[PDB]
Enzyme design. Sequence first.
Site, PDB file in Angstrom:
ATOM      1  N   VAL A 262      -3.921-109.848  36.374  1.00 46.33           N
ATOM      2  CA  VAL A 262      -3.959-110.199  34.979  1.00 46.33           C
ATOM      3  C   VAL A 262      -4.852-111.580  35.222  1.00 46.33           C
ATOM      4  O   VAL A 262      -4.605-112.332  36.051  1.00 46.33           O
ATOM      5  CB  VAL A 262      -2.386-110.855  34.606  1.00 46.33           C
TER       6      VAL A 262
ATOM      7  N   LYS B 285      -4.362-113.712  25.705  1.00 43.76           N
ATOM      8  CA  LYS B 285      -3.707-112.978  24.632  1.00 43.76           C
ATOM      9  C   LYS B 285      -2.338-112.861  24.589  1.00 43.76           C
ATOM     10  O   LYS B 285      -1.551-112.844  23.747  1.00 43.76           O
ATOM     11  CB  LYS B 285      -4.051-111.431  25.172  1.00 43.76           C
TER      12      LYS B 285
ATOM     13  N   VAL C 190      -4.875 -84.808  21.571  1.00 44.95           N
ATOM     14  CA  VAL C 190      -5.123 -83.465  21.554  1.00 44.95           C
ATOM     15  C   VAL C 190      -5.757 -83.321  22.965  1.00 44.95           C
ATOM     16  O   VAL C 190      -6.829 -83.681  23.041  1.00 44.95           O
ATOM     17  CB  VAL C 190      -5.951 -82.847  20.297  1.00 44.95           C
TER      18      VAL C 190
ATOM     19  N   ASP D 221       2.467 -78.876  38.856  1.00 46.17           N
ATOM     20  CA  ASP D 221       1.366 -78.929  39.734  1.00 46.17           C
ATOM     21  C   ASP D 221       1.580 -77.836  40.810  1.00 46.17           C
ATOM     22  O   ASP D 221       2.520 -78.644  41.757  1.00 46.17           O
ATOM     23  CB  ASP D 221       0.916 -80.124  40.043  1.00 46.17           C
TER      24      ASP D 221
HETATM   25 NA    NA Z   1      -7.251 -85.430  24.678  1.00 47.94          NA
HETATM   26 NA    NA Z   2      -4.329-112.818  38.207  1.00 47.37          NA
END
Ligand code: NA
Ligand code: NA
EC number: 2.7.7.7
Length: 328
Positions: free
Chosen positions: A60, A67, A98, A187
């Site tokens: 961060v 923000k 998609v 997987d």
């Molecule tokens: Na995609």
């Molecule tokens: Na930081």
Amino acid sequence: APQETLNGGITDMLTELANFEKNVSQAIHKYNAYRKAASVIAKYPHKIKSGAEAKKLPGVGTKIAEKIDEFLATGKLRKLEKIRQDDTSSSINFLTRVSGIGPSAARKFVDEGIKTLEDLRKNEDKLNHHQRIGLKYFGDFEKRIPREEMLQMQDIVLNEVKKVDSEYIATVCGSFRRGAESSGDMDVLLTHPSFTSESTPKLLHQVVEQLQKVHFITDTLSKGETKFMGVCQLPSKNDEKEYPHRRIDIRLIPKDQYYCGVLYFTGSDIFNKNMRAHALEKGFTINEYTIRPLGVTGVAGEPLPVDSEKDIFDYIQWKYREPKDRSE
DNA sequence: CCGACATCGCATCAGC
DNA sequence: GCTGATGCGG
DNA sequence: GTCGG
Ligand code: NA
Ligand code: NA
Ligand code: NA
Ligand code: NA
């Protein structure tokens, strides 16, 4: 982990920004920066009160702190509110959901007026094979898979693989192997004693073919000599709602690199990072394929023999840890 | 300040 | 036609 | 966007 009620507003905001970076601005590194910020915040056991507080967390920085200050004081972020209403950007961002439609295809579609699934449906001729499949199963692909279904799926895969050749070795990895209650896909890592890094090409095809023969595999996204990516579906019971179609990948890996593969594809990502770190500080270099010694000048030596996941742990003086304990 | 942020299999494009 | 680049996904 | 050499 803390309830989303703590900093969910912030994490949702960062994740949304992340998607636009990836899908609209095509800035993958910013996408990941935002994701990393969301993750470190998502695990912070305190309700954030300021951007300064959040900035102390790794990942961060100055911009996200700012923000956060804006979101805490106004309950929103002007830039995000704006992008959301933007018809072009919101459409591009959306189309990427998609499978097969990435940032490039999405932008092309929107540029010519194709902005919705409806529009996609009306333009099959402009979609490649992968994309048509992603469209066909748009909804199913976004659904998660309960562990019970994953167990039924594993039963089929292991049974059919052994049926083709009893010497095949197949392992369903991912979070499922770590014991997770749900999975996003399946997987499967496959190997055969006849296939090594230095010894010869149809081992994968025969397994994919059998899974199709019993109607488990329903569609193919891509398929080569070592990697198959497709779709599958559990058989439904009479008068029972059919199961959703699921994504399944099957990889053929040389026997001598199989367990390095299982380890890697079992994760989690945080665990692999750590293990690769410890392995390094121990004089070893571990990747998804092998584990090699590092000479004094840093010259990697030939890969060391591995016959199990444990062999790997042993090389780096680490007590073997169960998959359920590899959360980190 | 400014480069790293993983890497590769497969499908398909772009160039010759 | 062949070879390398690109898009995509993981 | 964030980190760090
Ligand atoms: Na995609
Ligand atoms: Na930081
Ligand atoms: Na996507
Ligand atoms: Na046999």
